[PDB]
A and B are shown apart, each in its own frame.
Chain A
């Protein structure tokens, strides 16, 4: 039980940190589309392409 515990705890820690690195490093690249999606949302809310 403790063996199945220490291993899963260690890999959990190392995967949490790796996913943190994924998160911070992929956080801002998708903001290239936030402008155009805001634009299409405005177009939907107005009922015109503007």
Chain B
């Protein structure tokens, strides 16, 4: 037994030495890769090396993802798809100022709904002979707003809803769809999408502005003042419809995370086209040729057209790390370093 004990201590200190050997080994490899990849060309070499592995990544049984339609439990979904089909029928009616005033009045009546909860409860009964409800709503704004507005509100309240916040958010959603069509007519769809994404970047990376926009109880006039003001502080946001969207969204934040709400806005904007968002991270921005490579290989993977968002971070030490919805392909070399470190014997 004493012999066994001495063998135990010998072998255990042996394993200890092995471990602190491997740790400094991975340290040395880490600084070696860090000073090697400092070559601006070698970062591109690594990423387009990973790109051929991506070329040998097919296939993937991807599914289309929806902005909030996949969030509502039931009864509200059917209602939401019915209303989006109704607005798809509406799609060509309104004109420029038509659509913009549609959005303004719809967000105003959303404020009106969230101002009187009891009337929302009443108009959100999931009953069959909903006709008194529709009377109610026109009784509210018979001479206050536009006619197709009142029509779509009628067909909305005609539907059944599992809750109250579902209809509240649905009218916001159809107003956003109207603004999306307005931006579409102008032909800036990818422009507005990527500018919302970039504003989401600058909103999340310095979340102070995000939180000071999340003030629930504070009135929203100063909120939108602050917001637009910070936006048109520079004119790299020449497009005004982005400002319209974000303003009439922050008007009814309802305690939502701004740093997530703006991503939600961008994602529904891209989802209008049927594309799937795909965030990516790397250490240095690549040429737009490599962007074409990435978009084509990701479309081949997920069987849908996709858009990217390159959030620069050098600490990833080259390579890419992509995330599509709720799965991740992590090829950046720093993740491999952490893996080989944690998987030491």
Contacts and interface: CB of A to CB of B under 8 A. Distances in A.
Nearest to A37: B25
Interface in B34-72: 36, 42, 45-46, 49
B337 interface: yes
B291 interface: no
B28 A47 contact: no
B51 to A, nearest CB: 12
A23 B10 CA distance: 10
A2 interface: no
Contacts of B29: 38-39, 41-42, 45
Interface of B: 1-2, 5-6, 9-10, 13, 17, 21, 24-26, 28-29, 32-33, 36, 42, 45-46, 49, 333, 336-337, 340
Contacts of A12: 2, 5-6
A11 B45 CA distance: 59
Interface residues of A, number: 22
Contact of A41 (B2, B6, B26): B26
Nearest to B24: A34
A42 B46 CA distance: 12
Contacts, number: 56
Contacts of A38: 25-26, 28-29, 32
Contacts of B49: 46-48
A27 B14 CA distance: 10
Interface string A19-44: 10001000100100011011101100
A40 to B, nearest CB: 9
B170 to A, nearest CB: 50
A15 B7 CA distance: 10
Nearest to B339: A45
A9 B2 CA distance: 8
Contacts of B5: 12
B9 A39 contact: no
